[PDB]
């Protein structure tokens, strides 16, 4: 995939340190190899990206240059070898060593993001159980859900409608992975992509992402019906 592509990381020029914290937290916890990497917007060279990678418990940074030849983006670590995209650039350097400083090294494991859920239509950062129930009540359908942040640290909640009743599943951010009960996923984004395909609680799958727009394009101006922490289906 493009797991490795992190784009603009955090507060403007705090991206070098964020790139290091992310690579450090990942490489130490998972036990990833030297060569583990990710790409992001440059914090010094406008429009250029930066290749941050792990090597000997340190995190080294490389500049990815971005130029236009015939109004066509071209990317490169060195002008003797230019690519039509960052995928090509990355995939090349995964196979043949890149030279940074005065050491030669190939790229290895793509380091993903833990927070790609923050840009999803079903994710609500500030949302009370009662607030999400009120929203979930407004929707008549089943398999219509929303994930929200809980007050207790490194925790989220899947609030959903199942068999005409509103139940709640707990998820925990265990460092670089998430844990719904004894089951494990890379992230929420991947967890919900699984529970979109497979049932999460009983016969119900995660089909309809509810936000403010979804209440307009579906929901009822009237909450009250019938409507504890529920246990999901294993694995």
Numbering used by the authors: 547 to 773, 782 to 789
From the paper:
Among families of proteins involved in signal transduction, phospholipase C (PLC) enzymes that generate second messengers from phosphatidylinositol 4,5-bisphosphate (PIP2) incorporate a number of different protein modules. The PLCγ ‘specific array’ of domains (γSA), comprising a “split” PH (spPH) domain flanking two tandem SH2 domains and an SH3 domain, is inserted between the two halves (X and Y) of the TIM-barrel catalytic domain (Bunney and Katan, 2011).
To analyze the structural and functional implications of Y783 phosphorylation and the potential for intramolecular binding to cSH2, we obtained the crystal structure of a construct incorporating nSH2-cSH2Y771F,Y775F (545–790) following phosphorylation on Y783. The structure of the tandem protein revealed an intramolecular interaction between the cSH2 canonical pY-peptide binding site and residues 781GFpYVEANPM790. Residues 774 to 780 are not visible in the electron density map suggesting that this part of the linker remains disordered. The structure shows that the cSH2 domain makes an essentially canonical binding interaction with the extended linker in which the pY783 side chain makes multiple interactions with three arginine (R675, 694, and 696) side chains in the conserved pY-binding pocket. The side chains of residues pY+1 (V784) and pY+3 (A786) are directed into shallower, hydrophobic pockets (formed by cSH2 residues F706, L726, L746, and Y747). The side chains of V784, A786, and P788 all make van der Waals contacts with the cSH2 domain, burying ∼620 Å2 of solvent accessible surface. Although the structure of the cSH2 domain is not affected upon pY783 binding, a further, more detailed comparison of the crystal structure of the phosphorylated nSH2-cSH2 protein with the nonphospho (apo) construct in the same crystal form shows general similarity with some subtle differences in angle and distance between the domains (not shown). However, the second binding phase is highly suppressed due to occupancy in cis of the canonical pY-binding site on the cSH2 by the pY783-linker region. It also seems that a relatively small change in the tandem cSH2-nSH2—induced upon pY783 binding to cSH2—is allosterically relayed to the nSH2 domain reducing the affinity for FGFR1 but with no corresponding allosteric effect on PLC activity.
